[PDB]
Design a protein around this ligand. Structure first.
Ligand SMILES: CCCCCCCCCCCCOC[C@H]1O[C@H](O[C@H]2O[C@H](CO)[C@@H](O)[C@H](O)[C@H]2O)[C@H](O)[C@@H](O)[C@@H]1O
Ligand SMILES: CCCCCCCCCCCCOC[C@H]1O[C@H](O[C@H]2O[C@H](CO)[C@@H](O)[C@H](O)[C@H]2O)[C@H](O)[C@@H](O)[C@@H]1O
Ligand SMILES: CCCCCCCCCCCCOC[C@H]1O[C@H](O[C@H]2O[C@H](CO)[C@@H](O)[C@H](O)[C@H]2O)[C@H](O)[C@@H](O)[C@@H]1O
Ligand SMILES: CCCCCCCCCCCCOC[C@H]1O[C@H](O[C@H]2O[C@H](CO)[C@@H](O)[C@H](O)[C@H]2O)[C@H](O)[C@@H](O)[C@@H]1O
Ligand SMILES: CCCCCCCCCCCCOC[C@H]1O[C@H](O[C@H]2O[C@H](CO)[C@@H](O)[C@H](O)[C@H]2O)[C@H](O)[C@@H](O)[C@@H]1O
Ligand SMILES: O=C(Nc1ccc(F)c(F)c1F)N[C@H]1[C@H]2C[C@@H]3C[C@H](C2)C[C@H]1C3
Ligand SMILES: NC(=O)CN(CC(=O)O)CC(=O)O
Ligand SMILES: NC(=O)CN(CC(=O)O)CC(=O)O
Ligand SMILES: NC(=O)CN(CC(=O)O)CC(=O)O
Length: 900
């Protein structure tokens, strides 16, 4: 079951209203583009955790009662100039005043500054540790105003320009916000690196696919309107849900490439249509009915590959999922609206301006025909090697190591940790809430502590177990509700976390108190637990729905099961090279990144994206080889017909995508590099090794078993348009006796009954011809009967004429019908008058014949029918009749009215 009546309708409709269409959509895309530049101000950095987990619950309760921890917001290492010691009172007074200035100039953003520098005469050991022992360094804590991560980062980025000039500029800022500003700032550099490098490179790859400026520029314009509109959509989405920072580059990395690839593939088909002889209107419609459906289905495939990501609770993956969907749907819509309308207006003009104005696959597939196992077996091995570095991979949260090793903020963090060890902590929290609502007594606190001391592995600095699990600090932002108490202690090994959290939760609460285990390790481990929990379901939904969509596309059970195996191998192989690059560390030196575990949600994203890419490239390649089977062409070069037809397009499309992805591999954010490289690898793999070799090999051997259609699973083949339906349009179909334009009694399809004025003489003839008493009325079947006889009579007359027989034998079945049509209309003697045009048709000079025929009096007297017939001669298809300007008003009986 399918509907191309929808696409045939739109293909016609979009040409008709091409001005309204191109005006409206551009207005929205540029409108949304203007609305969508404010997106950078409404994105979030939160969404990496499971907000339904126990650790998040512990965090919200903790921040409510005790106040959120603001001590790690801004850490600032101060160092005296000229080898001076930090004890220098003049330098102390100067810097203290500088710091007090920044705070009073920004009281809306800064809570204040805390450190040894504020009270140099102190005996508090921890405060005395805020200075190094050689007295060359000292750091301060600068807590900021704000009630969520985004508002706090905004407050930092406001005070940063002045905070940086403190102590003559020699102040090193670190902590959460200087790192967050740097991490989120990577998005901006990646956007501009794409503008500068990717766009000109794409323009070049485009002007090498088409040898023409206008033709090359259109897919680029589509890509621009896509991004603009998509950013507007996402900005609108941000009005309802939180949209993560990382959703912005996804719109560019994935959205831009596919939009241009869509535009490339559609403009490419439009020129093909024009070349084969179709006029602009028919060319547009045929493009939409074919390549347009390929684009829409491609969009469906990608969406079906991305929706399973919604199974994960992380807002990071959700907003990214929304971003992918918005981008691809808009790209698919724009490619068959704005682009189609543009071509409809331009027409053959798309090739006007040349390159100067600015200023073989089938042989190789045949080489892999001859020896499947020569290539295939030796590839299945090469890929499963790649799957064993995949086998070993680790997972971790965001750290300063996500930035390059030479990043100034990362190093300032790493210098802080070296100069001032023990300040940066990751304690696990035991959050206690009494349900009935009354205060928590010290006995229950001491009770929980004893149970906390049951579990080994928690830090004990000064070797005293009853000073462990100290109460969490309280500040002025906490409600200090007595029914909630929090105790905490760090782990001695962080790798123990997952086990210890399960142990801390395995503990049994004091009667009447609920215990939530929190802390940054707990937040991270719970998030990882969530992903591995729902990953099997996603993979199933992913594999099933794509395989189901391939059932619909191929018309086979074998091929989808085969294709899913191909995807799972490109996926496993790619993720293996990825693990080999970013965990095992190969390529880190050249690329300036630090080998480390991967971000966990990136794994779901990279599975969906790689799988979708693999599936999309397969469906396009294979369904054209299916076409050979539909045509009756044998398997062996069915496989070759499809590979060659697509060959130059796929490379051009993949190259364009590779160029876009290749610009993001230089990002300073390491999880961006992981994603971008994952594309390049899977893309080059799918566009070379998979496409060129593995697929043709494997398909041959299950040689004709590839296609298999249990029952009605396969589609029945449509009624083929015939000469009956053709002249039913040009001469009409009447089931009751009427008078034609000469007042002669006619019936069926222009079938002259008699030139007699007597209706009963006419009824006599009809009764004769049909074989029954008709009362002047026949069925549709009987009309086709009369018509067939008339056709036979005309063909006999044609084969009898010395001027018509040669060209008639020369012609294909469709063009033969075009000639019989002319014979019906004006008779053999009339048609034989087109001596040169007939010669041109006989020599298959379709273009010259079509042009010459339109210069006849035949064309001037009956343009609509002539244009139809002439078009049929030009293209050799029924296209001019399957969709047409309805309504013949003037009925005239044809020659060769055959009587029995
Ligand atoms: C990416 C990770 C980034 C790395 C994270 C860096 C963490 C740095 C932590 C810095 C915490 C500095 O420590 C804060 C110390 O002073 C605070 O204020 C107080 O100072 C003296 C009290 O001793 C008195 O003047 C006042 O009571 C009061 O103002 C607390 O009251 C003390 O409890 C605490 O000992
Ligand atoms: C586009 C690229 C993206 C770059 C990534 C940047 C990441 C930088 C790390 C910043 C994390 C700040 O962490 C500090 C806070 O951690 C937890 O609270 C956070 O987690 C809770 C449960 O979700 C929320 O309820 C709180 O709102 C939320 O502040 C603690 O409870 C807070 O006491 C502590 O102050
Ligand atoms: C607001 C309410 C609106 C909500 C509904 C929006 C959802 C849109 C659903 C429409 C799905 C149509 O997509 C499926 C169509 O195209 C696919 O074939 C394409 O793939 C291969 C080319 O590569 C070849 O099979 C064909 O040449 C090519 O058309 C399918 O296999 C066909 O069965 C079907 O004709
Ligand atoms: C758009 C594309 C932009 C650039 C594409 C680059 C992709 C990187 C593919 C894999 C990188 C290897 O090839 C380039 C690398 O060769 C060497 O590696 C050396 O150490 C590695 C681990 O031990 C091993 O590769 C060898 O042992 C040894 O050759 C250099 O030491 C690296 O500095 C350099 O990176
Ligand atoms: C078939 C595949 C098609 C491939 C298409 C190619 C895409 C076009 C993009 C080419 C622009 C190359 O730009 C290279 C970028 O890195 C440079 O050095 C950095 O290198 C490492 C991080 O990248 C670290 O060491 C430091 O951040 C820093 O030294 C600069 O920081 C940037 O200004 C520059 O833009
Ligand atoms: O680029 C894709 N897909 C794709 C890209 C990036 C992704 F991140 C992803 F998930 C994908 F699925 N498909 C192209 C389009 C569609 C169709 C004909 C042309 C143009 C060749 C080929 C197949
Ligand atoms: N020493 C190196 O060659 C760097 N290596 C790192 C390593 O050997 O593990 C890979 C690279 O960075 O290209
Ligand atoms: N359509 C035609 O063949 C018209 N021909 C008529 C002919 O061949 O006698 C004139 C021409 O070719 O210029
Ligand atoms: N379409 C009509 O009503 C009459 N037609 C003549 C015909 O259909 O044979 C004129 C034309 O095709 O331009």
């Amino acid at each position: 079951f399918q509907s191309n009546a929808m696409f045939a309708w739109w293909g016609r409709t979009v040409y008709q209203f091409r001005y309204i269409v191109i005006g409206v959509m551009v207005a929205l895309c540029l409108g949304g583009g203007v609305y969508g530049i404010s997106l950078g101000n409404h994105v979030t950095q939160s969404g990496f955790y499971d907000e339904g987990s126990q650790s998040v619950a512990a965090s919200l309760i903790g921040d409510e009662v005790y106040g959120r921890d603001r001590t790690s917001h801004v850490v600032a290492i101060l160092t005296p100039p000229d080898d001076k010691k930090v004890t220098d009172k003049a330098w102390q007074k100067k810097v203290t005043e500088e710091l007090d200035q920044v705070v009073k100039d920004h009281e809306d953003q800064i809570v204040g500054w805390v450190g040894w520098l504020k009270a140099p005469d102190t005996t508090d050991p921890t405060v005395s540790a805020m200075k190094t022992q050689d007295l060359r360094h000292t750091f301060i804590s600068i807590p900021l105003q704000g009630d969520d991560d985004d508002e706090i980062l905004k407050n930092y980025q406001v005070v940063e320009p002045e905070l940086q000039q403190v102590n003559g500029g020699d102040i090193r800022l670190a902590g959460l916000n200087p790192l967050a500003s740097e991490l989120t700032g990577t998005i901006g550099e990646d956007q501009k690196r794409a503008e500068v490098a990717a766009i000109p490179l794409v323009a070049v790859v485009l002007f090498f696919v088409f040898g023409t400026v206008i033709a090359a520029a259109l897919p680029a314009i589509i890509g621009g309107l896509a991004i603009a509109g998509a950013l507007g959509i996402m900005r609108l989405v941000a009005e309802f849900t939180p949209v993560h920072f990382f959703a912005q580059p996804v719109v560019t990395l994935i959205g831009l490439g596919i939009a241009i690839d869509y535009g490339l593939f559609i403009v490419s088909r439009f020129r093909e249509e024009i070349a084969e002889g179709y006029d602009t209107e028919a060319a547009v419609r045929r493009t939409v009915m074919t390549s347009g459906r390929t684009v829409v289905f491609s969009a469906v495939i990608i969406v079906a590959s991305s929706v399973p990501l919604l199974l994960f609770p992380q807002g990071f993956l959700k907003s990214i999922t929304y971003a992918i969907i918005a981008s691809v749907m808009l790209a698919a819509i724009l490619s068959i609206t704005v682009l189609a309308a543009a071509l409809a207006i331009l027409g053959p003009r798309v090739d006007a301006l040349g390159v100067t104005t600015l200023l073989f696959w089938g042989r190789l597939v045949n080489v892999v025909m001859k020896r499947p196992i020569a290539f295939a077996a030796p590839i299945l091995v090469v890929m499963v090697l790649l799957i064993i570095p995949l086998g070993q991979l680790s997972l971790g949260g965001i750290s300063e190591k996500y930035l390059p090793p030479d990043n100034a903020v990362r190093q300032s963090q790493e210098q802080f940790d070296k100069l001032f060890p023990g300040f940066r902590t990751e304690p696990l929290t035991l959050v206690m809430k009494r349900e009935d609502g009354e205060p928590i007594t010290d006995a229950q606190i001491a009770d929980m502590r004893a149970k906390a001391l049951t579990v080994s592995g928690f830090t004990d600095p000064d070797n005293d177990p009853e000073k462990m699990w100290k109460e969490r600090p309280a500040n002025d932002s906490g409600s200090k509700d007595p029914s909630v108490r929090v105790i905490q202690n760090g782990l001695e090994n962080r790798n123990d976390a997952a086990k210890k959290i399960d142990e801390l939760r395995a503990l049994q609460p004091p009667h009447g108190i609920e215990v939530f285990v929190g802390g940054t390790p707990a937040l991270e481990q719970d998030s990882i637990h969530s992903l591995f929990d729902k990953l099997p379901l996603m993979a199933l939904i992913l594999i099933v729905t794509t395989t189901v969509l391939m059932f619909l596309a191929f018309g086979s059970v074998v091929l989808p099961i085969k294709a899913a195996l191909m995807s799972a191998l490109t996926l496993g192989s790619t993720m293996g090279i990825l693990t080999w690059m970013f965990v095992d560390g190969h390529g880190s030196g050249l690329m300036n990144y630090t080998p480390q575990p991967l971000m966990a949600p990136m794994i779901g994203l990279i599975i969906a994206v790689i799988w979708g890419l693999s599936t999309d490239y397969e469906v396009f390649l294979v369904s054209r080889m299916v076409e050979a089977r539909e045509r009756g062409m044998s398997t062996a070069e069915a496989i070759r017909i499809g590979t060659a037809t697509t060959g130059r397009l796929i490379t051009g499309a993949a190259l364009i995508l590779a160029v876009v992805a290749g610009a993001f591999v230089f990002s300073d954010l390491v999880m961006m590099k992981y994603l971008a490289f994952g594309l390049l690898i899977a893309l080059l793999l799918d566009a070379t090794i998979i496409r060129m070799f593995l697929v043709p090999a494997v398909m041959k051997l299950l040689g004709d078993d590839c296609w298999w259609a249990p029952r009605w699973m396969k589609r029945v083949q449509e009624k083929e348009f015939n000469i009956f339906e053709m002249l039913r349009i040009d001469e009409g179909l009447r089931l009751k006796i009427y008078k034609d334009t000469e007042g002669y009694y006619t019936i069926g399809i222009g079938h002259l009954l008699t030139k007699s004025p007597s209706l009963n003489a006419a009824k006599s003839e009809l009764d004769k011809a049909i074989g029954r008493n008709t009362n002047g009325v026949i069925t549709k079947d009987e009309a086709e009967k009369l018509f067939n006889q008339d056709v036979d009579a005309a063909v006999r007359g044609i084969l009898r004429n010395a001027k018509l027989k040669p060209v008639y034998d020369s012609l294909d079945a469709v063009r033969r019908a075009a000639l019989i049509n002319m014979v019906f209309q004006m008779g053999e003697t009339g048609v034989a008058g087109f001596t040169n045009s007939l010669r041109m048709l006989q020599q298959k000079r379709w273009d010259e014949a079509a042009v010459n025929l339109a210069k006849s009096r035949w064309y001037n007297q009956t343009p609509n029918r002539a244009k139809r017939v002439i078009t049929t001669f030009r293209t050799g298809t029924w296209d001019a009749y399957e969709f047409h300007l309805g309504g013949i008003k003037a009925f005239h009986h044809h020659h060769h009215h055959h009587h029995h």
